[PDB]
């Protein structure tokens, strides 16, 4: 009797194992830090882990772009979705820390992407900011605010 052995196989293009419970918090007040001119909370540095089977490049394997709901009163920001509905916004920074990128544009490859071995760490900065129509009029209230940003890793 012929016992031929046939199969299929693949390789796991996925995320690394160092940072699983990644949730950034903000220990900043709302009634004091958002009633004066600049309305910003301190930046919280968080990184994005990448253990793929080929660490030769970044744009030739992963086209990182991020989506989500956009803030109406603030162009270039995300919706906060909480007690301060429309009064606060979500800012986001790249690896250089100065390029205030847009909700829907792709990540600019070629810069600030240190290939630490077979991994690929992408540090990002995000701090909650207020819309100037609610900042100057001082209509923001203190409370709980939970925002969510979706980062699609559309591969090649």
């Amino acid at each position: 009797d012929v016992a031929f052995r046939g199969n299929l196989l693949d390789r796991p293009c996925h995320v690394s194992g160092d940072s699983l419970n990644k949730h950034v918090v903000f220990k900043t007040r709302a009634s004091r830090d958002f009633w004066y001119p600049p309305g910003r909370s301190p930046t919280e540095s968080f990184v994005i882990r990448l253990e793929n089977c080929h660490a030769t490049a970044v744009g030739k394997i992963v086209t990182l772009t991020f989506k989500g709901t956009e803030e109406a009163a603030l162009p270039g920001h995300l919706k906060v979705t909480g007690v301060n509905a429309g009064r606060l916004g979500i800012a986001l920074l790249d690896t250089d820390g100065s390029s205030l990128l847009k909700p829907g544009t792709s990540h600019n490859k070629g810069q600030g992407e240190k290939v630490t071995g077979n991994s690929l760490e992408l540090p990002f900065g995000a701090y909650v900011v207020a819309t100037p129509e609610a900042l100057r009029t001082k209509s923001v209230v203190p409370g709980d605010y939970e925002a969510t940003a979706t980062f699609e890793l559309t591969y090649r």
């Binding site: 009797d1 052995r5 196989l9």
Partner: protein, 316 residues
């Protein structure tokens, strides 16, 4: 006086036995044929010629000597035994090599003819006597290998004549000179052995998944093949190499599935390649064809892996 002249037949009959199993016993017909025949044993104690003018009694008894055990062309015994003996009279069954069949069809008649009462060994006469049939079932032995067979059974079947001179004469040939008769009549029979051993699946498909490379470096895929017998044989199977293996994994039977991916075959847990099992009666057993996919020297090249490993079961 009592004269006996043995006259043996010359029939060479054939029959195809078909494709049988070891537990199955094929039945065959050994007919009586009234054809050409030749003398094999001559005696003279009384007169040598006759003109038919004296009183002489006649009797004629059939003589069939068939073998019980018979060796093969490879040296195996075939226990041929009777289920129905026909209208004959089987006697002297205490012998180990041969049966002795008899039939009294002509046992009391007076003749009036001019003949030769004791013929020489170079003699041929006419024989036209329709007799009853006889039948046998070949009870095959336990151990018998695969293939075709050309077994010939030795048999002396032939009408003897008993010449006497008085009314009420009873005389048969003694069995040791009847069993030390020449190997004249053969039988050309062929029968194909398909073997008592057979698997139940007849093709092995092992459902192993669409997996990642980290679990591809060490994975276990198992499939059980059930072999079911009704004979106490001791089988042996060889995992025959069919495709090209890539990596030299030592003593372990590596099956290269292609695209830089070998896989060893683990029969019953260990990587032996061949195992040893004894069976004692009718039943079945299980053999797990395990597979370990470590065919990697850390130069990974993913492809469709579709090798083969045919196992052939040979009866030793």
């Amino acid at each position: 006086w009592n004269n006996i002249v043995f006259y043996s037949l010359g029939d060479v009959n054939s029959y195809q036995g078909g494709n049988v199993v070891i537990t199955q016993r094929p039945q065959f017909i050994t007919s009586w044929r009234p054809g050409i025949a030749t003398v094999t044993w001559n005696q003279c104690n009384g007169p040598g010629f006759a003109d038919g003018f004296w009183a002489y009694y006649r009797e004629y008894i059939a003589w069939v000597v068939f073998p019980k055990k018979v060796m093969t062309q490879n040296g195996y015994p075939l226990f041929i035994e009777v289920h129905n003996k026909g209208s004959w009279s089987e006697e002297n069954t205490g012998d180990n090599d041969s049966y002795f069949f008899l039939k009294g069809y002509k046992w009391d008649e007076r003749a009036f003819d001019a003949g030769n009462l004791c013929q020489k060994p170079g003699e041929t006469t006419r024989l036209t006597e329709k007799f009853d049939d006889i039948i046998f079932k070949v009870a095959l032995p336990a151990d018998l290998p695969l293939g075709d067979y050309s077994v010939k059974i030795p048999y002396t079947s032939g009408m003897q004549r008993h010449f006497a001179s008085y009314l009420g004469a009873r005389f048969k040939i003694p069995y040791n000179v009847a069993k030390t008769l020449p190997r004249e009549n053969e039988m050309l029979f062929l029968f194909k052995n398909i073997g008592g051993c057979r698997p139940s699946a007849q093709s092995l498909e092992i459902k192993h998944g669409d997996l990642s490379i980290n679990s591809a470096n060490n994975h276990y895929a198992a499939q059980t093949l059930s072999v079911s017998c009704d004979v106490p044989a001791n089988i042996r199977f060889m995992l025959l190499r069919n495709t090209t293996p890539t990596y030299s994994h030592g003593k372990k039977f590596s099956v290269g599935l292609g695209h830089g991916w070998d896989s060893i075959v683990s029969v019953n847990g260990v990587d032996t390649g061949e195992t040893t099992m004894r069976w004692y009666k009718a039943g079945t057993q299980n053999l797990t064809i395990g597979s370990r996919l470590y065919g990697e020297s850390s130069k990974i090249q993913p492809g469709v892996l579709s090798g083969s490993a045919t196992l052939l079961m040979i009866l030793p």
